[PDB]
Amino acid sequence: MSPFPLTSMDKAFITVLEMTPVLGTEIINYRDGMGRVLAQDVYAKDNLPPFPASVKDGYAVRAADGPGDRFIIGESQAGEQPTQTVMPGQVMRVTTGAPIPCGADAVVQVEDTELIRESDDGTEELEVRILVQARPGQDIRPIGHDIKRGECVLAKGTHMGPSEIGLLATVGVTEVEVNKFPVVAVMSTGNELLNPEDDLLPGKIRDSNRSTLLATIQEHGYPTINLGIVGDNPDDLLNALNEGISRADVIITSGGVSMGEKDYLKQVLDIDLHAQIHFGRVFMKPGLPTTFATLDIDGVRKIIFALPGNPVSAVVTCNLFVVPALRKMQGILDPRPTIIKARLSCDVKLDPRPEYHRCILTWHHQEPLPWAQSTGNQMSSRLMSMRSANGLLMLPPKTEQYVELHKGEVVDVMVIGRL
Amino acid sequence: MSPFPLTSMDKAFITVLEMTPVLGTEIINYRDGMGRVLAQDVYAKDNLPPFPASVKDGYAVRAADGPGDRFIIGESQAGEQPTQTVMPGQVMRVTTGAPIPCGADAVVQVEDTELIRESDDGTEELEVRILVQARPGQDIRPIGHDIKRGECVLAKGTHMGPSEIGLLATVGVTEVEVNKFPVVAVMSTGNELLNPEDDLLPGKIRDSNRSTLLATIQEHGYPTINLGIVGDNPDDLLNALNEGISRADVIITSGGVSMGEKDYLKQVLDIDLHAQIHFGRVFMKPGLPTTFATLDIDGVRKIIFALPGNPVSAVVTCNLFVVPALRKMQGILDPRPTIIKARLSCDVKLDPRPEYHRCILTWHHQEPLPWAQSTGNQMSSRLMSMRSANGLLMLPPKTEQYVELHKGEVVDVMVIGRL
């Protein structure tokens, strides 16, 4: 209250995470499971393979027969249970998917075989020399070999990608319990903002943050609501916020919250909404005037982020604070971002504060670390790349011995997009 | 023709890329630009900032007045062109977004100022001590400082993410020319396959590849078509393929194309479709029986991939060959995958062939290289992770001196998902 609390980066991060709830669950079709977190253990209802299956192209054979000269009684078809029993001195053609027939207990690949006789040839083999003494069970995948019936194939907490979805198809579990995704409402405040579709007017600029922020969170596959530009006054701020609270889990705003300004939005969170503002300023560059609040409303907790209006500050703070909170909301067990080591492409002058620059990570032939070419000082000095920024260069706060960093020095980088 | 051509991994990759066309263009709303490639240069139609803007909270001042005692004639409002001219001995309140008024040419931050007088106080300042001699132009962002009118802000070939979308909003370019995304049709062939929704029947298994493959390509944000399970016969293969050709750019099938089998599908591509099969087998593990064909139909080129039916082979080959082809199709200038250096978590026995294992990349505190824990030998030996595989461990072909690799040795890894 009054000039709000100044916090450290680390303390702010922990606060966002600790104050953010994990959302409840719902049942979805497995095809909609990308990026979802299982809220249940998934068990197999069948043994895979469900029948003993050949591991190779070759012949289902009796081991006891040994390397003799044999009669080919037929072929085991994929998708068809075999009807014939392999008797002494007989053999059945088999392909690598194929069910082992009732009389054989070994498979001899075709390479340890030679055609002796063919029914003239209208595409048919009648006799083969089996050149090998096979071991009982050889080249056969027994029932339950891959997955046993009742066994847990996916555990609670698994964050699912393509292969997990395919594992669910395999076991025939097509509906599945998972954590909900957060719905995120985005708005921009400022009397100087116009919609990107509008032409400029005196004293006005186009609003870019709303579209950048909506785009950033859509990339993680979370549903969004566009609440538009809200005038910078208590009446319109309150109404905008009330609509986001009723329609969303998270509200993000950006615009005029610095040392001067912070006023109307903090004033409505505090007085009208009775939200609990956890911090209003964070010791960092850029994004010092970042606010984090929570509203406990009807047993439910909504989270609110007031990001700065500066376009680079808004995108940085979204990636440092918002995305991690959303990752926890949708059930991810470790919602922290991946941070990797890279080399600076340039020299940089450290600031007293921890600083974050949008950058591009590039891996060059046979080098251990990628190079981080900083671009996130954008606007008046932009040397355009064909690539998007895929990381945040995390510059350390200046020390007494470390005033600047040199090209080639190993530094930390938050991965913020697909490499 | 007859047993088709055996190719190397590298040769196969180049062939896929070289034979794959770049798709044409279309105009989209900028909000739909995620992952798109600009097909035009984008130029600014306004100077940003469009007015000279304050860089700080403080006062618009006359430099020539120096550090005197001044009368505050008002405040410059964001979104409003100022009406008053700052005269000698006067000053206007200003916030960091705010337009510089017509008489000032310097901004003195509030920290180099002291309140002298306030109109009693109903929230109002009347006089300030300016404690500093400002330089003309100080703390002011001139017109065009960030972007100049007519200047190129985004070039042809730019692969767009959130910040680019926001840059388009900034310049008011809301419709934009970009390369189309490929539409990809997926089908599974095999007489032994059932839909994941079905319960098992004798000799049958559930089809998992279709859902894994559809999921993998949806993750890159490309539109898909599910063509379902097609029986393994020429009539039904032809009809399935004809439908994918009429509705899609790319057709992917998986199922029974090994040394035994390859038959019906290659036979229909060759004889009925007259597609040009570029390769039918590739010297690799897994996925040896991978086929790549192209169809030139009515001036248009369709591409066809016949992936193996083995579930791990299908997902590996999709990431090595399909995704890169789709990346080129949607206009990406360098469609090759990112390959990084990592350490093996285990010992591995090299194979004569180049081998690929799905793995999980993990960065540990303060270490240069991530560790690659191989999991992609899946099915009968799976020690479950909460994380999805996010890379392909690229094991070198066995040599005379290098028979096996040890835990901790630096190896290559294709990044296949978000870190």
Partner: peptide, 13 residues
């Protein structure tokens, strides 16, 4: 774990 960057010196081990 820290979301604040480390110095190249902290990379000594």
């Amino acid at each position: 774990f820290s979301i604040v960057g480390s110095l190249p010196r902290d990379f000594e081990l």
